[PDB]
């Protein structure tokens, strides 16, 4: 239940299917990582609480807690947790997804699929969204996907 970034694993052997963020007793990840399935954490079980396929987000144990947003000007850091690798920080200046409903920050970083759900951070260390829903231009570009608190 400790705050932090977590691998999301599945079981012959084990495979990392994604990443998520524990904050304020709530686990945050991308819908496409878990499809809302229950998660084991030690001897405990985490059940989904809120989720939305269009936003590609899901929270466990309580409502979505992450609310910081990219300021539109500053570099950010992807706290990538790739399969088989130590958590590591990748700094970048986001580009922009321009949509009919407004602009979304986007990071032009291409890590393995099991990195989906890794948090993107602002300079204060706040999570401004999660990595792993995006488009191809041949490079992948991820939206900075943030929920509503």
């Amino acid at each position: 239940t400790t705050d932090g970034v977590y691998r999301v694993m599945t079981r012959l052997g084990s495979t990392q299917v994604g990443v998520g963020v524990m904050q304020e007793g709530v686990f945050h990840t991308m819908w496409h990582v878990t499809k809302g399935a229950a998660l084991r954490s030690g001897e405990g079980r985490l059940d989904p609480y809120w989720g939305d396929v269009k936003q590609d987000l899901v929270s466990y144990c309580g409502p979505w807690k992450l609310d910081a947003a990219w300021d539109g000007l500053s570099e950010v850091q992807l706290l990538a947790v790739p399969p088989g690798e130590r958590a590591k920080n990748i700094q970048t200046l986001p580009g922009i997804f321009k949509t009919k409903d407004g602009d979304i920050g986007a990071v032009a970083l291409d890590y393995p699929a099991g990195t989906s759900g890794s948090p993107i951070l602002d300079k204060s260390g706040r999570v401004i969204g999660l990595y792993g829903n995006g488009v191809v231009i041949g490079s992948y570009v991820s939206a900075i996907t943030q929920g509503k608190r």
Partner: protein, 40 residues
């Protein structure tokens, strides 16, 4: 199929992070299935 979580670190900015990646400006659309697609 059992899905389970393992802690991998603190959520912290790192002063000495590797820096990379460009900053593209893209017109996109988001459909009902959560899929982004390019628009022209």
């Amino acid at each position: 199929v059992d899905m389970y979580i393992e802690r991998a670190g603190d959520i912290t900015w790192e002063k000495d992070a590797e820096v990379t990646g460009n900053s593209p400006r893209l017109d996109v659309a988001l459909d009902e299935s959560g899929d982004f697609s390019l628009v022209e």
